[model samples]
Target chain A: DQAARRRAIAAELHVSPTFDARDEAERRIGFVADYLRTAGLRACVLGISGGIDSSTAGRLAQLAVERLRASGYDARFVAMRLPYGAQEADARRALAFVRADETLTVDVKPAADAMLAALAAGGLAYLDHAQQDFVLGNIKARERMIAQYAVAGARNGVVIGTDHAAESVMGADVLPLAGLTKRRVRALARMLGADEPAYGITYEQIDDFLEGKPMDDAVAETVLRFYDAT
Target chain B: SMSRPDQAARRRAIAAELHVSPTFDARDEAERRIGFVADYLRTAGLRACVLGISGGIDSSTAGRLAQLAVERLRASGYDARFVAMRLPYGAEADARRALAFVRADETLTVDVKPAADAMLAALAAGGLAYLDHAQQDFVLGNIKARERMIAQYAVAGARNGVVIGTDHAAESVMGFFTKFGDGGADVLPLAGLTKRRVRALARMLGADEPLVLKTPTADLETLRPQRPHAYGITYEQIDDFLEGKPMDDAVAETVLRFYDATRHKRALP
Candidate 1:
């Protein structure tokens, strides 16, 4: 019986003698890149707010564009900043970060605010301020998405997504088409080296975003359990 | 009214005010947190756990825990099976490494090339007509990933084993997985660990270097390798920034705020 146990454990220990981990990693990257190139989108357009997700995505977009450019495709980066009554410092940082590349900075505040005010005018007054804020915030999100879509449509580009696994599942209802989580996005980022400091982004931010707060409203109770218990 | 940075600071301050301890050592903590999850599953009355091994630490550790559970179950006079199968477009090495971890008595492999090819051909028939031959490769790969999820469910049902998910905390935060694809699992054992902690658990289990160190790919196509990082984000940076470490503050805030603003993604209609 003891001998049998030893053999069983040995079976679990059967590591391949010839596998090179690094080579495998490179091979994986090539596989993903090949998929992106064939996905039928001209280039990727995203709202670059100088945040970890967008910033890392911006860098990855730059990387993808640079690589595709060498292969003779027009992969450009269009960075839009949505202030939404928020400060502009982060947007400035993002623009500067990708200064050498083709980027666009648009103040989405007017468009977003105008939509929210219009919603309020259209009998949304029964909702509380917080509820009103949420509805309006979603309007901003959709508005920003619309702006990116227009840019992508004209160029025939696919919007490169920054959504990850955790958030994907949580946001599954809102983003029926996307449905990725924070973890999955981070995994993609890691494989692409999008988190490098030289690119002016890091993984620490992703962690905080995932661990610190409950971002989605649908599963707030279950999601907040982790934070509330902490 | 707060600027992006102000919002970030406010968020962090809220966490602090709630008496939640924030750590700067995300990697270190992430590495150590795997045991917490592994032990939790063991006590949950799950006879044995099954994971779709992607040759990365998240799946590797989850697979290792499954093997450990199998060992314990056998000791307690119950039979457990450790099943690993190739999905259409999966990496050969990752498949091999996952296969290597199980005892012959507990191991099973189902070749899925036929299914993968059929799906790719179907998707290619109409979806990727606009793309050049080179671009067709990536679209077909995602189809392969979706196909593999179908295969995982088929095998899990046949075996009557709980399909364990390898989705981690970081992946969950951003909605990075396909809904029913890799996301369909009976139980997710590694849902809490970040990339750093998942790696640490791999080291603790003494996982093969390739499984521990390889860049994660969905293995949608053998010829073209796509890493998650290539998609414009990195787990390493996001994890560090979330824990309030001294990293790129501006970039981190932007990422966090973007995630915060998209909070509705987590809800169910």
Candidate 2:
């Protein structure tokens, strides 16, 4: 009986109807546009690794900068093509889609390679294990943040953040996605007209992975999920 | 409800639709009512439960149910003990009855008479005999209730047990009990029960028949004749009035009806 009542309460307390996913995405984009235009910002800098999250953030920033230009705001889209330990072809295709008035290609391999060499020289044990993974991942994330902020400062603009709801909840210091869930993010995307292409990509990838089916095209669901895996 | 402009209007319309007046008979549904509280405790994992046993019908009924629960759990090979503490307000007999009901294993007796006397004596020394006489009784009664709660927690801590409470919902909603006197408790097991249901449950659980059937009173006075009934109101009468049954509302009104009729008692401080 108690269990029945709990279920009833859960059913009764549905999420409010006013919060649509596409609307949320649009609102987020609008907030960036307003910051760029009203604050007299020059450009918006982001990274697009063809990963759905970053890809989505890049698309939103592109649309926002266009809106900013229409409102008499000097806005430019800059994508930093940084390849630390990434495949050359994938990075090339991702960097090719950038419509920025200016582009900067910073090959991070030299820095990462030199760092690894120095660590090995310093007698660091288990150089490619879990501890190495943590050290490398922290370095990678911090390096990306520094690159984004530096470009933003140089261009007189703001660093566009791509931290999603799931990552933010798991100890990522993102204030925008507070109290939001992955399901909510998807809903927001749906309300913003970006849901179909993105959700379709996600669904296809999940289905192909579960069935282990081969994709005829590289742009198929399997490829999407593969990009998401990064 | 949909047509109603405001909540008050909606509530009035709802009341009219049901043909029932707005009332605060908190413990009207007994087990079902308390089940909400039990669910809350089960989910929240409370530290302890506490309530004062005034040796009156209300407190006695509460103690009886608590004892039954403890005894059942004990019989089922669970570690559960009922602790009853007596705060001496000079009503030795009433304190004895309260102790007997809840003392499954241990009972603590804290005599507040000495402290109460000293405070009253100090008041008398200030040449405010009239004020002291009126206020000292209240002071003594409150001290007894508060001190007993302190002892209850102390005993509960020693035994690794929670202090159970006996606040009936109606009494709480109508503001019948003393604010800080008998109000402090860890968990109120009987808060959802009405006075009528409590008496019924007490009878079912085979409590001391006379104690269970006695007119409810807060024995604040040291004198015997100055009991709760001397003010000319009975528990049975209050219970019936609260239940919305036909009763002499002009004279012997229940706490709920009085709060409803007066409105000031339920108003903001």
Candidate 3:
């Protein structure tokens, strides 16, 4: 019955069932490397947030660069730490798992401060309050994207996004994990010994919820409403 | 005789196309723009306006208008203020004069030389150095413009304000400003006005006589003084071309070519 429910949800969610997670991981790694090589890109860059998604994405990007180099291609993977001010503990932890050729940490506070000041000078006073979290968060996100694009432009590289099936409905550029499900991603993470805690939520619970198994109602509701829904 | 009448008619038609009114009331237009800016700030829930004053006519006029708008809003019991920033690379005597004309409630000076140098250094580190002095100067000028914007926005963010720009149709038609540099602003109060009209408004707003009558210069990055003609054509020529006045074919072609080449700069990225 558990298997039956997983299959039903996977069908609806468009999750590709990999007969062997190890093989799928290798295939995706190869695909990322091949895509970069064929597209004439010199390198790939990704933002590492110390979460399951970015951690996995960053590791895979590093592996892809290694494979490309082994094939006599010159390519590098850049892992960037994009934080507003102080670095996050999880972000630092995630960087340890990513075997990147180069790492850059761009503090977005100065730029973010400049943008907020511009807005405030224009009369958006609400940004000074805690109630303007949504708008402020969006500014931070945009600043991060700007920083990433700048770094990429300087290096002649492409931005590697970490959107899997659940988040792919939104916009992104390079999505190597687009076809994989949350459950399958964890399976691959475990195969590569890359599994770790993410944002106070265990990968097991997240996978179980995505696979249609019963979980805590709060977590279930969030995943179902935002991530699972069409 | 036919060519004279025909050229006169063509000039009138072109002037109309450029959208410069033959008859304009500088005082009335200034007050109307001020009121409009105030109304926009109130309706949009913005608290203040910020702008960079370069001791130039365009910025002086825009700064004055912004100061007037904020004053009117405050008089009517609205919470609004104007922050006029003086961003200079080195010594700029005219900046003080422009600041006086604007009469903003808050004024600050942020030196942009350090930031500009850092960016140039980074670019050089990335192996993007230019051997040509002219090319490097041009690139550095663009960087300086962008740095000024960064300073303005930083101040705005700190004060919870909006960036006000001084871009007019004359500059817009010629794409004379830097993209995402001087062009990055929340609102442009002088959007539809021509250079000649801007001068008229500046005079009406009590701008310093010398500042208002000074020969316009593309003064972004220059070791020596520059004239508007340094850009290939003078502002008078641009104004004439925009107003549909008969211009030398060579000058007209140069203006149109610049306009065409810089169209991308005027667009959103």
Candidate 4:
């Protein structure tokens, strides 16, 4: 019975049964360039989160623009580092990986913190600490999106998303990573020589869970908790 | 979306975009907007209206309307009040006068200078420090607008009230206000009216000639004593275009450029 459930999860979250890193990379890169051509776009832009998915997508965007340029099209790739505060190292690594045509950095911290202070002053002082943390985090995320959109607007380009097939919540016009599951994305990251670090629970474990494969009970519990809590 | 190229067509198009009518009866429109405020407050179980008074025509008009809306609520056995805040970064000439006219139940003054400057400093340190003075001041203005709204929202939250924005069709169409700054609100009492109509409402409520006729300014940056904009057309002309009246080709073009370019601000993200 668990085997059947695992197959179903894998059927939904896993990529093709025969996933190949190099092959999928080329296919996604081609798709990006083709999209730009058909959409009459001149640039690809995305925010780099210093993670596997964003790095993968950023590399794809850079390669797409490079491909377009080789074909006699004037295209550009922009990668933005939207940090909430003074935090820097991880995003810097992602930007280095992107090697984008242009990179912009906007510190969203001041505005985000200022808004939190305002809200606290306004009435949220009464909010529970747990709920307050969630609300504050959302403001920072929104602040990041606002900066990205303003950049995309300025460049007359579409914003790219690093969010993959297994999870959700919207916006960002183009999603080059949407078709790839976490396992495939990590495999692609490895092939691309990306230096994305492993998370608290390994991508291996998460992908197994998404693919409906059972691992240790403790790992299963963590995955199930995150799935429902989020 | 040029269904027709002329100003008449442009006026209609602009009116449609701004969600305003070509014309509205002042008294009738006033009563309707007042009722909307009361209706919203009752439905939400909110007991107060909070607005910032900057002494400009828009805020002055909006402040009075909210004061009256709450007045109507009180008449019907509701415990409601309007709170007027003087959120000034600098000494504003007409700030006190506008407050006298609104006659709100509670009047509070907060110097927005401290919070706005702190945010500006943070932004500057955040990598905008390289911007020249001109550009920094420009960035600072938006910060100022947002800070003022922050003050308003703070008061609203404390009082269990809704934030009242002074935005209307004229500023809305031109995207004159900063995004999420003065543009953010819980309710807009003068949602559909033109600048001309806003003035008319002020008159209906016995607003003094000086207060009603004051030239509007965002006045957010310290570099400029009072910041005035060049929309390349007067408020009357904007109202004319918004009211679906015929306009000169030049005025029509100017309005179209602003309306088209700022459509992002007018839209939900």
Q: Which stretches of candidate 4 lie above 4 Å from their native place? A: A1-230, B1-6, B45-47, B77-81, B157-160, B176-183, B216-231, B257-269
DockQ of each: 0.02, 0.01, 0.05, 0.12
Task: Flag clash pairs in model 4.
Answer: A6-A212, A10-A211, A122-B154
lDDT of 2 by residue, B181-242 (tens): 35466666565455666766666555667777554335323122211223334445545444
Q: What is candidate 2's CA lDDT for residue A78?
A: 81
True-structure lDDT of candidate 3:
0.67
Cα lDDT of model 3 by residue, A1-230, tens digit: 23454456556655654348788878879878877776556788888888788888778889998999999999998888877776478877788888789887766666556545544444444544664554566556655655555455445566777776544432234677765656676677777777456334454554555455556767655544443343
Q: Per-residue lDDT for A30-86 in model 4, tens only?
A: 878877776556776787888777888999889989999999988898887877765
Query: How good is chain A of candidate 4, measured by TM-score?
Result: 0.81
Model 4's C-alpha root-mean-square deviation from the true structure amounts to 8.6
Window of ten residues with lowest summed lDDT in model 3 chain A: A164-173
Worst window of 10 by summed lDDT in candidate 4 chain B:
B219-228
By DockQ thresholds, what CAPRI class is model 2? incorrect
lDDT of 2 by residue, A81-159 (tens): 7667645555455445435555677666666667767887998877458888877767676676677778888878777
Provide the overall lDDT of each model, using Cα atoms, as 2-decimal numbers. 0.48, 0.53, 0.67, 0.69
Native contacts retained per candidate?
0.00, 0.00, 0.00, 0.09
TM-score of each: 0.45, 0.41, 0.55, 0.63
Query: How many residue pairs collide in each prediction?
Result: 93, 13, 19, 3
lDDT by residue (B174-260, candidate 3, tens digit) is 444222223368888887688888999988988757988643233434222111123444567777777776678777766655654
Q: Largest TM-score belongs to which candidate? A: 4
Encode model 4's per-residue lDDT on B1-269: one tens digit a residue.
45557657657776876688755788888888898999999988899889888887788889998988999988988879898988766556677888889898888776656555655565445344565665555555656665667666666766678989877787665453222223288999988888888898999888989988655355323223112253344567777778866567787777777665455322311
Residue range with the least summed lDDT across 10 consecutive positions in model 2 chain A: A169-178
lDDT of 2 at A214: 48
lDDT of 4 at B146: 59
